[PDB]
Structure formats: structure tokens, C-alpha cells
Amino acid sequence: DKISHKIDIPDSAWTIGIGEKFKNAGHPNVKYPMIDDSYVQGAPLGGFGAGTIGRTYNGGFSRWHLEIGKNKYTTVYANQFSVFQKVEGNKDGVAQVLYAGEPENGYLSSWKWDYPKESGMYYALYPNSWYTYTNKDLPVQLAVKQFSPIIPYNYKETSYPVAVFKWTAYNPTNKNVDVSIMFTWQNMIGFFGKQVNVNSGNFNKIIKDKSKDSEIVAAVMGNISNDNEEWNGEYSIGVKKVPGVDISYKAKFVTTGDGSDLWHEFSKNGILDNKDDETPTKQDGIGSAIAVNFKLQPGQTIEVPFALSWDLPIMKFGGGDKWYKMYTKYFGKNGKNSFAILKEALNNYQKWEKMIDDWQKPILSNKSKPDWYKTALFNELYYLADGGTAWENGKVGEKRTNNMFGLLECFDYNYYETLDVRFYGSFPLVMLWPDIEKQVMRQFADTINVQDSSEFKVGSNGAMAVKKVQGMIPHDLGSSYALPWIKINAYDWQNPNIWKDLNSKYVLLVYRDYVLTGKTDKEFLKYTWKSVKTALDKLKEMDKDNDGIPDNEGIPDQTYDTWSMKGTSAYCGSLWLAALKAAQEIGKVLKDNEAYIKYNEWYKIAQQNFEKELWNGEYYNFDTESDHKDSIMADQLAGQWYADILRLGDILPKDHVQKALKKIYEFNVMKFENGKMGAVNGMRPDGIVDESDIQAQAVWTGVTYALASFMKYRGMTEEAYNTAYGVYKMTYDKSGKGYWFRTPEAWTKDGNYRASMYMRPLSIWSMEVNY
Numbered sequence: 001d002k003i004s005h006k007i008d009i010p011d012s013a014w015t016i017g018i019g020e021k022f023k024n025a026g027h028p029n030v031k032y033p034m035i036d037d038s039y040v041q042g043a044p045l046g047g048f049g050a051g052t053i054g055r056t057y058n059g060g061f062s063r064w065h066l067e068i069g070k071n072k073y074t075t076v077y078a079n080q081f082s083v084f085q086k087v088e089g090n091k092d093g094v095a096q097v098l099y100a101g102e103p104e105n106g107y108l109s110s111w112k113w114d115y116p117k118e119s120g121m122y123y124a125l126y127p128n129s130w131y132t133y134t135n136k137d138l139p140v141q142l143a144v145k146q147f148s149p150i151i152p153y154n155y156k157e158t159s160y161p162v163a164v165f166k167w168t169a170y171n172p173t174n175k176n177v178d179v180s181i182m183f184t185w186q187n188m189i190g191f192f193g194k195q196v197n198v199n200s201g202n203f204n205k206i207i208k209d210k211s212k213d214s215e216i217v218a219a220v221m222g223n224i225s226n227d228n229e230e231w232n233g234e235y236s237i238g239v240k241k242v243p244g245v246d247i248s249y250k251a252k253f254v255t256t257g258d259g260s261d262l263w264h265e266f267s268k269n270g271i272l273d274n275k276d277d278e279t280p281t282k283q284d285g286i287g288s289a290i291a292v293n294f295k296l297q298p299g300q301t302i303e304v305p306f307a308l309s310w311d312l313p314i315m316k317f318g319g320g321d322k323w324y325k326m327y328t329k330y331f332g333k334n335g336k337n338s339f340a341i342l343k344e345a346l347n348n349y350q351k352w353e354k355m356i357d358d359w360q361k362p363i364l365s366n367k368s369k370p371d372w373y374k375t376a377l378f379n380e381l382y383y384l385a386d387g388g389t390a391w392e393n394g395k396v397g398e399k400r401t402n403n404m405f406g407l408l409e410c411f412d413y414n415y416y417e418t419l420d421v422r423f424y425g426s427f428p429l430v431m432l433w434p435d436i437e438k439q440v441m442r443q444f445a446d447t448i449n450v451q452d453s454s455e456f457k458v459g460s461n462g463a464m465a466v467k468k469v470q471g472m473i474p475h476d477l478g479s480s481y482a483l484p485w486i487k488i489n490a491y492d493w494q495n496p497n498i499w500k501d502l503n504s505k506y507v508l509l510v511y512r513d514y515v516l517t518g519k520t521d522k523e524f525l526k527y528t529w530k531s532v533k534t535a536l537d538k539l540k541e542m543d544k545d546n547d548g549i550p551d552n553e554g555i556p557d558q559t560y561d562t563w564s565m566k567g568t569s570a571y572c573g574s575l576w577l578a579a580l581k582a583a584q585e586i587g588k589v590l591k592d593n594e595a596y597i598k599y600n601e602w603y604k605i606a607q608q609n610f611e612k613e614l615w616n617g618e619y620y621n622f623d624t625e626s627d628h629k630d631s632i633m634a635d636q637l638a639g640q641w642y643a644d645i646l647r648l649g650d651i652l653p654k655d656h657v658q659k660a661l662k663k664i665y666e667f668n669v670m671k672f673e674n675g676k677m678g679a680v681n682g683m684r685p686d687g688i689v690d691e692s693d694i695q696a697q698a699v700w701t702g703v704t705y706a707l708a709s710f711m712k713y714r715g716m717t718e719e720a721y722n723t724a725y726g727v728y729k730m731t732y733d734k735s736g737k738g739y740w741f742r743t744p745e746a747w748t749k750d751g752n753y754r755a756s757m758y759m760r761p762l763s764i765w766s767m768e769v770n771y
């Protein structure tokens, strides 16, 4: 490996060998079908609301999130980078697809597949990833840096459906070498969203943009139809000329054939036929190819950028609603703009690299923080783009001043912005894209007094319940299978209208968003104040025994939606205390004296009673009435966690908080697989895992990172990092379970999982709240 020193890979990048087999991978631990796309994954490409494309460490374009809200894992084998190399004065050269694999069927059988093992590495530090190619049969070594412009406090480039591939080639040998790099892409119009005739009308064209001292050559892969539908638009790939390189292209090769129409040209001398051909296809799949060729002298390096764009302006949801995607604000809505997007990237990618370096640098340059932590912190952010993210710029047909946003909980449970989960998972948004975060919270504020009296069947018990009760915060803002933002509470396993955490979590999220954006946004507090008061007043009515605290009802009436709580719970009860303290503080800011007085009085009574009912001398009991009420819950003081972040002070005595966190570390972490897998949710006082429910005996990745945050700002530094380390290790390490770029909700002690690609572990960013 002589190429690594010509490029700049941070030491904290996650790494794996190209073609590496992983032996220890986890699988779903549930009874019902659940997504398992394997460990062959990589950092995604694409902006927020754009649809994303997962290119794996083996090089394939395989995890397709272009249909917003859907996860489709299938390798489109035509989509590749390939290399030709010939030592000057040899008879023949060699050509190789840079993919550690081959197709299932006979299509593209002419190409040289099966990039060999031990011949390159993949590196990822989201939003950047890299591949190096150090192959004994390729005298020139190559690397590529690939990324999309995901940039905090930037709501423009961050939305773009674009990826840059910046190649570096270096000749360490004593001979001249002829080198070509070729990007191939299938015209994927009709890959999703088209019910019949999936290739029909697809056509490819070549654009040559020759301005002064500059040239871009691109293929635009579209359809002759001007229908404004989810399936229609354009893909583009292309390259920018640099000194020393020539460009060649082929507009049309057949992807549903043996591929020799393209490959006979490239394998001969690395130079394509430059044949334009706009003939539309009928049944056959087609694609385009863009190549560069250059000669490298001994010791010489060259850099060449390629790019990929996709203008698919319309997202459709299963209930029928069609929306424009966010990026259409900047490029237009007609679906004929892929070249413009591509050109913008090719002309500005160096600036974008610098902007990415500027935001990563403060963390990367802090030498008190271990590299493993940095690996997890940046790489967990894959989910903001990859989580079915929807960001609308208008309903198709009919303009407001805001752009509605939603991130899925996950794909298995296809719910937008699940509030009991976003309590943990929305940290990166408040800290890095706060205008989005406030928009999401205003969305929730608007739903609080919605009433929907129609009934649904509750999954856990078969009872019928009202869909949405006035004054109760909803569980979620709909499903991609139905009507995001319009039909809320898509979730039905439990009835969220009787949850005891949603209303308190809502208030805490509101006050968080004010505090962590500098305590200046009074207008945001004003917008949400009526909803905050309503939320707390409604929850207070669920106090059945007059101790001033809502009563859990002996069912799973909160985020641990199979783990029953009864009476006063540490979890919901601490959240209630913190929510009351937040509302007091908002009361003061807004000069609502009577609210301050009321919530202050509620707080004093509740706080006194919480302490009396649950403090046992070492920790706070799980609750006052359950069968294992004295279990040690990892999340028992979630309210105090948030109160620390919100600078609300002590809701409980410092000494007791400290004792409880020490107990959690000593038990839930260190007595669960030697502290190498995170914090188990429930432990019995004798040091054995609580087995009363599957949730009690799992580690929740987001709970655990949040607990690490809580420990850290209570000065338990070693405990904090050791607790977080088990999550990092299981996710990313060779001794883990192979969950990189699909961090799950939960795993049991065997390492097997529930719900890959989950929002909750974005809570790692709560470990950085001074950002």
C-alpha cells in the first residue's frame, strides 16, 4: 500500500478489507419476518430528503432508499467503477471491475468480475468514505474518496441528490503505465414506482459542457415521457476533465445482455467508442459509460473527479399523496435537472470537502477523545440521510413558508418521527440542523388538539380504541405506506393516547430545543406554549391516587412497549418531574405567572412523593406496584438526564443520582457480558438479568448512549465511555456482530438483534452537547 500516503484518511475511519468475509454476524431475534440485509453495507450517498444509495464496502450499489420510506437491498450490477491498466510496451493490458463479487445470472458475463481479496480496503467516516486498490496485478494504485455534501447549519447542499467520487492514481513503479477509469450506470428509470413496462421509453444522451479552460462530459439517463410521476426523472453520471486526461464515453449499452458491447472496447485499450445514440428502449435495460484515460510516469500522481446525480423530483406515499422533494427548491421540479446538479458538484466539490473538514475538525482534533468514539459519533449520522427521510417542497398539484420533515423510526416499524424514540434520536438535528428540529416540533405542536374519533384495533390485546384524543401528543406522524404528516398515529401495537411518557417527552423536547439553540428563540416557545400546557394538564388527569404523578396502568404504556409499568415508575415519573420544571421555566420566560405557580406546586408535591415512593437507599425502584418493582432499570432517571442537558438543576438529590448511576454501571453494564455490550435494560438486585420481558433483557443502543451522556455530565467519565464502548464494539469491531451502517434498536446477550437501521442510537450525539 503506497496510495494511502497520497490521500487523507482520518485514523478514526471505520475500516474493512474489500471482499472481507465476516464470520460472526447477528440475525433478527424475533418470531416474525424482519429485515436482515447482511453485513455487506457502507456509508450512504445522497442528501436529506433526496433518497439515498448505499454503496457497500465490496463496491456495489446495493442498498436502495430512493423510494422514500422503503428499503430495497439488491445490487444493480451495471453500476460500477472499472479499471484498465497497461504497462507501456506490453502486448496487452488488464481490465477489472472494482467489485468483490459477480452477477447472479448471465447478464454482463463478459466483464471481469470478482475483484480479489487482500487487494484493497474500505474506510468510512460519514459523510466521507474511501476505497483503496492495491492489487499485485495493477501496477498503478488507486483510491477514491466519495461523499455527499452533508453539512451542519446548511439546508441547501445538504438536500442534494448527488455524490462525488474523487479519484487519486499513483504510479510507484519504474515504468510508464496507461490507466483508464470507467464509471458505468444503468438507466434506472422504472426501477421503482412504475407498474408496467419498466424500461419502456428509457433513453440516454450525452452532454458535453465546454466552457473556457474547462470540460464536463456527462450521460443523462431519462425517459421520453414527460409524465410528472414518482418513477420519472433522470440519473446522470459524469466527469470533469483535468490536465493529463482524455475523456471517452458510450451513451448506450445493453444491461440485460452480456455487456460485451461496452467491455470489448474498454478491455482492449481503456478507450470507449464515443458513440451517441438516443434511441429509446422497449424491454431491454440500458446504461451509459463515462471513462478517463491517462498515462502515468514513474512517481506521478493524478486526481480526477466523477459524480453521480439523480433528479427524481416526486415522492409518493402509499396513501396516495405526492410531494416534491426539498432539493427541487434549488434545481426545479420538472425532473429534467440531473445535469445541472451534477455540474454544480463537479465545479464545487473541493469547497464541499473543505466544509465537511471544517465541521469534523473540532472533534477529530480533540486528542483527549479516543478514536473509537469518533468512529461511532460520525458514522452513526448515516441514519439522518438513510432513514427514509422525507423533506417536502410542496404537494404535487397546489405554497407555505415551511418544509415539513420526517425521519423514520426504522424500516421494520415504518413510522415518521416517533416521539418516544426522537426523545433520544433527535440530538444530531437539534445540535447540527436546528431549523429542521424546530419545524418537527412545531409539527407536533399542531397535532396536540387534533381529535380523530374513529377506532382502530390495538394489536397487543385486540381492543378497539380511539385513533387520536384531544390533548394527547401522538406517537408518530404517519407511515410511508400511508399519509405522512396527514394521518398521524400509524402505530397500533399499543394505544399511544394513554401513554405516560409522550406528553412529558414533548415538553422536554420543546425546552431542549430552546436551550441548545442559545436560549434566544422566544417565538418558538410562544408557538408551542399552549400545547405544552395542554400536554401537562392532560397527563395530570392520569394521576389516579392523588400523589401528583401520572399512574402507569399495569400495561406497556410508554416507549418500552412490551414492558409493563404500574403505579409511579422511575422512568415516567422522572420525566414528569423534569417536564414540570421545564414548563416552570418557560412560564418565567414568557411571563405566564399563573402557569409558573401551578407547575411549581405540582412539581414540589410530585418530587417529594417520587423520592418517598421509589428511593431505596441505593437506586430508584423500577416502579411502586409491578411484580419485579425493585429491578434496576438502566433508564430509571431519564428525567434527570434531560434536566442536566436543559440546565434545570437537580430534580432529585445529587448524592442519590450518583448512587443510582454507580449501581447501573456496576450491575446493568458490568454484570452483563463483562460490560462489553452496553447496558441491559433490567437487572434484578441479585445481579441476574430481569427476564420478565424480552425488553428487560436487551440492551437498547440508544438508551445506552444516552446513559453514557448522563454519566459523562455527572463526572463519571470512565464509566460513561466504558458503557458506550460496548455499543461501539458490537456495532463496528471485528469481535462484534456486524451492524455497521444499520445500528439496531436492541440486542440480547447472544448478540442477535431487533430492528436494524434504527433512529434511537443517534443519541450518541447527546455525549457532545457543547457542540
Ligand SMILES: OC[C@H]1O[C@@H](O)[C@H](O)[C@@H](O)[C@@H]1O
Binding pocket: 409, 413, 415, 418, 420, 421, 491, 558, 559, 560, 561, 745
Ligand atoms: O423497540 C420499542 C419501540 O418499538 C417500536 O415499534 C415503537 O414504534 C416504539 O414506540 C417503541 O419504543
Ligand SMILES: [Ca+2]
Binding pocket: 542, 543, 544, 545, 546, 547, 548, 549, 550, 551, 567, 568
Ligand atoms: Ca399517581
